[PDB]
Amino acid sequence: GYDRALSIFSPDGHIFQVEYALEAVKRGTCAVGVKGKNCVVLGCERRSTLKLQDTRITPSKVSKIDSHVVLSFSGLNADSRILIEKARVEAQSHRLTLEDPVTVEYLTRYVAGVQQRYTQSGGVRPFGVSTLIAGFDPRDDEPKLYQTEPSGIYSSWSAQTIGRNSKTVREFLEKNYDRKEPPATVEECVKLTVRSLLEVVQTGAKNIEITVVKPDSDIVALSSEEINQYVTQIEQEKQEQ
Amino acid sequence: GTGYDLSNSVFSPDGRNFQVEYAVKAVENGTTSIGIKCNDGVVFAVEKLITSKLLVPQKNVKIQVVDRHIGCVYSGLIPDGRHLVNRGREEAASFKKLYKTPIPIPAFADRLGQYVQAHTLYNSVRPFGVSTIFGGVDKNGAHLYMLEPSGSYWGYKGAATGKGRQSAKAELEKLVDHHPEGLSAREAVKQAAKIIYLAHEDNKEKDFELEISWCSLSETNGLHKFVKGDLLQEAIDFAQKEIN
Amino acid sequence: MTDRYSFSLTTFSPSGKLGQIDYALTAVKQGVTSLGIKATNGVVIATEKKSSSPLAMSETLSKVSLLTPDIGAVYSGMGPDYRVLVDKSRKVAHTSYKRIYGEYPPTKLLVSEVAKIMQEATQSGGVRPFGVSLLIAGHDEFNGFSLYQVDPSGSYFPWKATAIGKGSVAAKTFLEKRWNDELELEDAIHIALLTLKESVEGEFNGDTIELAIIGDENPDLLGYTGIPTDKGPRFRKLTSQEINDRLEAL
Amino acid sequence: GYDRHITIFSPEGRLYQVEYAFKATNQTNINSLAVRGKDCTVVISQKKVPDKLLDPTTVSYIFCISRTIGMVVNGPIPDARNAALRAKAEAAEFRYKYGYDMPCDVLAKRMANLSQIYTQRAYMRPLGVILTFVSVDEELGPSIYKTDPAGYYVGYKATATGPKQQEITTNLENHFKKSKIDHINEESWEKVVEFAITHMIDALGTEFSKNDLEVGVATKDKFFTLSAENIEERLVAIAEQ
Amino acid sequence: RNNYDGDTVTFSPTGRLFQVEYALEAIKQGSVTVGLRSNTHAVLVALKRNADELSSYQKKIIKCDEHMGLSLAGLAPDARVLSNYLRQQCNYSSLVFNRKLAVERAGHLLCDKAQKNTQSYGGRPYGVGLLIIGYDKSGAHLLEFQPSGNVTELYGTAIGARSQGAKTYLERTLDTFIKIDGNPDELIKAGVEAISQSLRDESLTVDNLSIAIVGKDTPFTIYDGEAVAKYI
Amino acid sequence: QFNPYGDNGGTILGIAGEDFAVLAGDTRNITDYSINSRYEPKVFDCGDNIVMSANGFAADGDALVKRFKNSVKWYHFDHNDKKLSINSAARNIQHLLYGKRF
Amino acid sequence: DRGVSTFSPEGRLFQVEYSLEAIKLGSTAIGIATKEGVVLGVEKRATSPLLESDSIEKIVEIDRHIGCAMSGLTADARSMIEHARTAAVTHNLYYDEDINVESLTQSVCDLALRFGERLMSRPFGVALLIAGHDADDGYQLFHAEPSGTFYRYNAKAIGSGSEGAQAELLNEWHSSLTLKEAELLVLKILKQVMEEKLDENNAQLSCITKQDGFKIYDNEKTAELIKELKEKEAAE
Amino acid sequence: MDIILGIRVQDSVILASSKAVTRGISVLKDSDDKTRQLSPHTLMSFAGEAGDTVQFAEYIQANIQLYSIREDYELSPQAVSSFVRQELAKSIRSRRPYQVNVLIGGYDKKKNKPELYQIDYLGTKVELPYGAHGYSGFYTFSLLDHHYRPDMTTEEGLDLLKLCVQELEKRMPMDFKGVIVKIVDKDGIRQVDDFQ
Amino acid sequence: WRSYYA
Amino acid sequence: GSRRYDSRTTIFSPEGRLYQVEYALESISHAGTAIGIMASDGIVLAAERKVTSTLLEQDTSTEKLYKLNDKIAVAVAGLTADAEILINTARIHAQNYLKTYNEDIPVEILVRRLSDIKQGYTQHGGLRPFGVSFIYAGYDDRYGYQLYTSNPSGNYTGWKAISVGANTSAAQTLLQMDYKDDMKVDDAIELALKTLSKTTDSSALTYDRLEFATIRKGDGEVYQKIFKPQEIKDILVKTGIT
Ligand SMILES: [Cl-]
Ligand SMILES: [Cl-]
Ligand SMILES: [Cl-]
Ligand SMILES: [Mg+2]
């Protein structure tokens, strides 16, 4: 039984192992989510330092938890699997014992609880991961979007981004998202998402992935052709005096 | 040691276990306590420093009994002593439960020792902060024993440990010359009071209260009893006389 | 009063070195030379019984050890470690093979098992690696003769011949010279005594040399007769006399 | 570095804690030697009682392990009695489980194997003692087997242990070089005890009183220890030759 | 000291166990409390401490049975633990043996419970001091518990910050109050004076004064607030 | 076979008035056809103005009362000497009993 | 790196005392006791404007008669709440009665010290205002710290503003205060110590009364209360 | 003795399952769907001891659904029936074994073949063109042996099934309150809502 | 100062 | 007590990197290079032995290429004994999956479980990571030929061609140039052999310093071939390196 306390307080009241876990997130690819009026979109970046990777089979950064809920993340990939599994299992347990799928908040509160437990249990280190969890409550049309962090804290967001250069992307979103009039179309919500990744990706559209989640378990990821189609026009409306 | 004295089970480069030696310092700093073996039993005596006139006299007993025939006294960290005695009490019951006969004194000695030595084996425990004087009458005699934090123990004619150990040992070696053909249970009680008084002159700053117990095949029927009442005063007196 | 050492005592250093394995190997290097040679119809393993007092009785101590009736082991490094590894190896050869298949394990698999025992001392909580290298030599029906080396890391490799311990780099070169794929067992026994002769500076005779072979089946060592498919053991330790007889003819 | 404190390797490939454990075996300043007779085995050891307050009869480093195995300990008494109990235990269990008396060499292997362990598991220290086991074995004849804190053990024509090990050893080496045999060719154990006490004196350069020694004998039937009087008888005889 | 005080399983080169000593320092920071006894009763007087003008006053006295109780000075959480264990022993003795737990035996049981946390790796000593009073078959009793494990029987004492004031007073008035038999109101007054000798820029009020009494035919009961008006 | 249950007889009665309540039982304790005692009280005062009786197998009956009484003692220790409402006791005894459901 | 249960040379447990520092950085929270009920308020303090400030829950119900406000590492509070709610429901299952406010506080504090190497690895990084009503000691407000200790306060403020905000309460609090007086007074003190202009979106009110139990005020109600307070002030 | 019938025609698999739930003396319900959908193309019916029956089924359900989300892929029917047999084969030597029998009917969207599997509480599994559990086989197997053709249409199967259900209504002492019928084909799982 | 002591 | 000697093996650096994972990767960088290249019709695994002597027997020697399963194989780079531990658990997992579902384990599921195990040694239990990196070459009737890599962190990803061990930044750059999606198996074979000869820290590339294996379409099934010493010498002449 190895139970040494790895997350402890230091004299100024910090918990360095949790804070250093946040540093793991900062080093991770950028992830972003945007709420529409009738949908939610999650976008992630693909590191472009690796040109020879099979994209058929490399695990995507957006994961289905249940047929109505998705989770993306920035941070250590391997850590992400543990959270994603725990969450997929819990959703199925919820369906069993309540005869109802999880609310987007509930599944989030669950993931965050696991993340928190790893910050005050002997023998374990915090998760180097932050998540964006999105979807629609069952039999409900109001889109939902939440964020969790290694500390266990979670909250909801009209739009939000995490990972390397999220300060930039958040500025962009903060100066492009009208709470009072949120993107009224799927097509233009995905537009606002690609745009914000282009502040920090540049490069190609095979280094972006987009996923559209719509009410009543309607989840689809776009293809390079679909995504590049948004790269152009975005880069064209640019060049315009 | 040069790093070699921060954990317990660690050998220094000349073969020592400093953590045990540091425990001995705790024993040496303790109250003085003795045992005198006689021709048919053992006497135990101990010094009770009266820290303050607020301590109730007669009322902080220090000598502990094990089973019905074994007496124990210790110097140093008192709660450590109580701990060991408890283990001894368990160990004597286990032995009697299986073998029926109450535990022979040498058998008891090694039960304690094995346990104390056990506490020098791992850096997750510290040595016992006590030296213990114990003995009794068994199927073939009286036996006195003293047991050190290292776990070492041997059988003694008389033994002492604590702050006044040196005065005590000196007076006990004398006691073995004059009264060498043998020392009777009753004289050993008297001589015990003498030795505690003489030993108390270190710690002369504070007053003290004498406490004696014995276990004599003829005077207690082989059972451990506390010397109280008249026989005690007779010894307190014999001490006052013989120090001048 | 319980094993409160739940954590690895062997970790990666910033350079990528697994320190305690490195040091364990060092301990092997200090150990007496031991060597093995594979021939077409036998394998031989030899080492020096350098006694630690003329009052010690060298026969009471074997560096060469029978693992199965067809497999032998010799070592270089910390003897007491080798000893408890021979116990572990003999037991595993039963619990994890004989009790399941009714056969003794074949050489590679037993070697594989010993490796796992050492690999684990490289990663489990609160323990140091083993401080020995092993040369295991033996024979099974489907793989023939074989010779293996197993290191404190848990790595093993199969050899035509090799040596470990003190004058190993020297002796390795000596064996590379004299070894072909046509040696008979008697030929290799010769080369072994010769290769051992340089790594040894004092007296060199059948009382200071240990040498055993995996060869023909010795039905005379079986102990019982009447089961014709039981052929008897291929491992055999040479006698003190049997060594000298070849030492004169050297 | 911490490799001086627990039983792990030094960059030299060494176990300092095993080495420092050896140094503690001499902490008693007591010498011992054992030799084999025609049909007995004798171990002799110094007996030093410096405190007038000690009961000399309770002071010994010779333990009767089984009816046939005697064990002499070179080292501090607490570790020595710890070792003795474990051997007494191992020998009673061996008899129960297997139906014969545990042989001297076998007990040595078993204790040396336990010894090895404390050099490999970090949570236990070696014992600061060297164990000399002697018997007249029913298969091997008179036997001497000795184990140390390194986990090493072997058998000896004769042996000696302690601070003046070397003087005694070179003494006995000379005698066995001249006699050319592996034992004292004497048929009485009383004579063999004398031989031992003799060559002890000639090698330490000191005479012995009947209270300076402690003597143990193993015959086919049993292993027993000699009294002060059985010793004085021995000493008298040595003086008449 | 630095090298010898990171746990309770390390001796100092001079024989001390710093972790236990640092534990005693918590007691000295606690608020003063006094115990004293005659031949017929035993009394606790305690000075309760508050945080603000707006906060309550931390309780200092705890009933353990109908015949036994203690006052605490130091880490209040730890006293809860120890007083809970003491209530359990009192209760076991009552249930299994139909026998009230002798005060001496409570002391012994307490000492041994605490001693476990000076030989235990990964544990800590208790950070609290306890004054225990009770009436059993051998009369009135007062015990002083220290986190070292040492439990001591006295006629009187006081522990906590500025405790020396009350202590010296009790050593002075000793022969007087031991004889206060069969007059509880007069023994409490004796205790209230003793604790008074330990104030510094503070006067006893109904909100900060707390008093407990037990003895022959008077079960352990606690007075706070208006109940303690009588004695100021 | 060892049968862990017995029957010590007894009859008990409890009546609730407007400002009062009574609980009564005979004081005879039996085994088979023998009398164990002609006065062994079975109706007990538990404090906080609760009287209790557990009639039938008397060892079990005593055990239950003993354990409820302890429940009261610890209720006080754990809730500032608050009186134990009869209705609250009733709930607590349900749990005491159902703990041994099997 | 010493051990988590270690005592300092001044008699304090390091990890507990470091834990108290983290609490000082937490968003502010205030509770006030009045013979008409008890008021809990919190600084929400959203980080970005995209953060939906409704999902910021620093006031939670424990039972119908017991509410709780938190300040510090708030993620550490989830399981203290879960235990508290379970103690409230369990006590009712066992005794067919509501749990006492102090008894539930005592239960929460018993978790605080269960760490070492001893299930949890470190103390909690969060403090609690626990406000409630029971029929033995009426309205009550309690302050629970990761030290395991707790005090009953007539009013108490924890977090960033605490040091100053508390001195404010010592002057403004009196026993004949009314529920509405303490509502405004909580809004007032919060507005002074927050860094943003207080509005019905970065601050939250709620109370506990015998008749209506524990409610968290909806934005509408709080806003209509913020205005009324701006006006009483301009009326100098 | 509830009725668990299954027949695999050429393009689909048909499960017919008795609707009645009788506890002792009363018939508690006449509309009980003894089915769980294990995935879009796999349907399992079940009969046996009271609580065991649904517990096992929904347990198997949740497990296949979890596998589906994790691999974003729908396990073949052969693969599901193997996981199901394994669970029961584990159960039978457990403390309280599940006392459930099941039919598993699925469309193998990869082989484009319908498949019907029969598994009893012991973990006995057989691949069959038609199957039943309990006494139901005793009246219906002679009908099915006769009129069954491997190339029957879904409508022919339904007609043959109607025949089987009518013989059960004639000769079986229990009123089982009719059946619910479900079809599994390339397009998923639909319930024939007007069956006689 | 310190009010963490009773 | 013993807390004095714990190298905390599962902690974060102030930059948010996992010390022992980084140090273990440093270790792996000194191991013989292994390469995997995926063609339209097969997969090629080639690796370099760091252990070389005249007397070393190579007919019966394995150090880098291991069969997990009839349709999956691994190339190993790192502590070869750590590899065997992880390998045998993987060989089991494939057999467990077959027992449960009566279908061969899909390549990715096996890769995930092996990587999940590594990730565990990274987050709890206080043990050291496995100093191992894997290239997985497998075929399944759902994604066809697949190529993967996992390392001590427990992260895994899929590749068209990839390298592990020594000189990977060099080798990966050579592969990025000359790899074309429409390559055939024999093209891939020689791309791999030619990448090693350009990055080897050795004199020349000789058969006695290679292991080599191909997974190709066989029969309507998939054959898995681990070249014998002689077959390697041949392919080295055929492509012209000898
Ligand atoms: Cl956990
Ligand atoms: Cl091991
Ligand atoms: Cl108050
Ligand atoms: Mg494993």
Numbering used by the authors:
A (entry chain R): 3 to 243
B (entry chain U): 4 to 247
C (entry chain P): 1 to 250
D (entry chain O): 11 to 251
E (entry chain T): 3 to 234
F (entry chain 1): -9 to -1, 1 to 93
G (entry chain S): 9 to 125, 132 to 250
H (entry chain Y): -1, 1 to 195
Please give the exact wording used by the authors of the publication that reports this structure.
The eukaryotic CP is a barrel-shaped structure composed of four stacked heptameric rings, each consisting of seven different subunits of either α- or β-type, arranged in the αββα fashion. The luminal chamber formed by these rings accommodates six active sites of three different proteolytic activities: peptidylglutamyl peptide hydrolyzing (PGPH) (β1/β1′ subunits), trypsin-like (T-L; β2/β2′ subunits), and chymotrypsin-like (ChT-L; β5/β5′ subunits) peptidases. In the latent 20S proteasome, access of polypeptides to the catalytic chamber is restricted by the N-termini of the α subunits, which form a kind of a gate. To facilitate the design of proteasome modulators we determined the structure of the y20S proteasome in a complex with Blm-pep, a peptide capable of stimulating the three proteolytic activities of human 20S.
The crystal structure of the yeast proteasome:Blm-pep complex was determined at 3 Å resolution. The electron density accounting for a part of the activator was clearly defined in two pockets, between α5 and α6 and, symmetrically, the α5′ and α6′ subunits, even prior to the introduction of the molecule into refinement. Despite relatively low resolution, this density unambiguously defines the five C-terminal amino acids (10–14) of Blm-pep. Blm-pep anchors deep into a pocket between the α5 and α6 proteasome subunits at the face of the channel gate. The C-terminus of Blm-pep is buried at the very bottom of the pocket and is stabilized by hydrogen bonds with the side chain amine of α6Lys62 and the main chain amides of α6Ser33 and α6Gly76. The main chain carbonyl of Tyr13 participates in one hydrogen bond - with α6Arg51, whereas its side chain provides multiple contacts, mainly through its hydroxyl group, which forms hydrogen bonds with the main chain nitrogen of α5Arg20, the main chain carbonyl of α5Gly19 and the side chain amide of α6Gln31. Blm-pep binds at the same α5/α6 intersubunit pocket as the C-terminal part of Blm10, however the interactions guiding the affinity of the two molecules remain considerably different. In the structure of the y20S:Blm-pep complex the enzyme is found in its closed conformation, which supports the fact that Blm-pep failed to activate y20S. The progressive increase in RMSD from the core region to the distal ends of the proteasome indicates that although Blm-pep binding does not induce gate opening it causes small changes in the architecture of the α-ring, presumably resembling the initial stages of gate opening. In fact, it may be described as an intermediate between the unliganded and Blm10-bound structure. This indicates that although binding of the HbYX motif at the α-ring may be necessary for induction of an open conformation, as demonstrated by others, single HbYX motif binding is not sufficient, and only induces an intermediate, but still closed conformation.
